[PDB]
Amino acid sequence: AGKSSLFKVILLGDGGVGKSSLMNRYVTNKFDTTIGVEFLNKDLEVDGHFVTMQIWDTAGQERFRSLRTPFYRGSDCCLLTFSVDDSQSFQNLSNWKKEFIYYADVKEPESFPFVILGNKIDISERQVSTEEAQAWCRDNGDYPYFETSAKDATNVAAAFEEAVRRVLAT
Numbered sequence: 314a315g316k317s318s319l320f321k322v323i324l325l326g327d328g329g330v331g332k333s334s335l336m337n338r339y340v341t342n343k344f345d346t347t348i349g350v351e352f353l354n355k356d357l358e359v360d361g362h363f364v365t366m367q368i369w370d371t372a373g374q375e376r377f378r379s380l381r382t383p384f385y386r387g388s389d390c391c392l393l394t395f396s397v398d399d400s401q402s403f404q405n406l407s408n409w410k411k412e413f414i415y416y417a418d419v420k421e422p423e424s425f426p427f428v429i430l431g432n433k434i435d436i437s438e439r440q441v442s443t444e445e446a447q448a449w450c451r452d453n454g455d456y457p458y459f460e461t462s463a464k465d466a467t468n469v470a471a472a473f474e475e476a477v478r479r480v481l482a483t
């Protein structure tokens with residue numbers, strides 16, 4: 314039978330930025346306004362090869378954070394997510410990157426693929442400009458940056474497709 318490779322992607326970011334909604338939008342093409350760790354699978358294709366992505370949202374319960382970090386290991390790409398209406402969530406990207414590197418024990422962090430998502434761009438009143446987000450991305454690893462909306466689907470599939478491409482580029 315036609316083989317398929319399995320890529321593990323993890324979503325990290327502050328509560329409320331839209332991680333669950335992004336994954337659900339990508340996999341089910343629905344949005345509608347979950348307590349523990351959840352992961353979903355999606356088939357796609359890259360350069361004519363079948364692949365499957367397994368998307369983890371490891372934001373269970375904060376008092377049990379120590380029990381969620383074992384599930385970082387084996388991640389092939391990390392999608393760091395903030396909301397463009399929430400500057401605090403943007404300011405926390407660096408700390409999310411650090412948590413991931415530490416608890417996933419990334420041995421070559423300078424080469425590990427990250428993708429940055431600025432979600433909720435359907436909201437006109439922003440606290441983070443496009444330019445400020447792009448500058449952070451350029452200056453903190455030159456990661457791909459997507460302005461997304463789970464609510465309207467803008468750039469959602471593109472962001473996840475890019476995650477798999479970045480994995481392949483190793």
Ligand SMILES: Nc1nc2c(ncn2[C@@H]2O[C@H](COP(=O)(O)OP(=O)(O)O)[C@@H](O)[C@H]2O)c(=O)[nH]1
Binds near residue numbers: 327332346436462
């Ligand atoms: N306007 C808007 N609201 C969104 C978007 N994505 C998620 N939401 C809402 O923001 C809240 C937090 O979403 P959720 O996916 O639970 O965030 P998580 O805590 O990061 O998993 C919910 O009320 C969502 O409906 C979006 O792209 N646009």
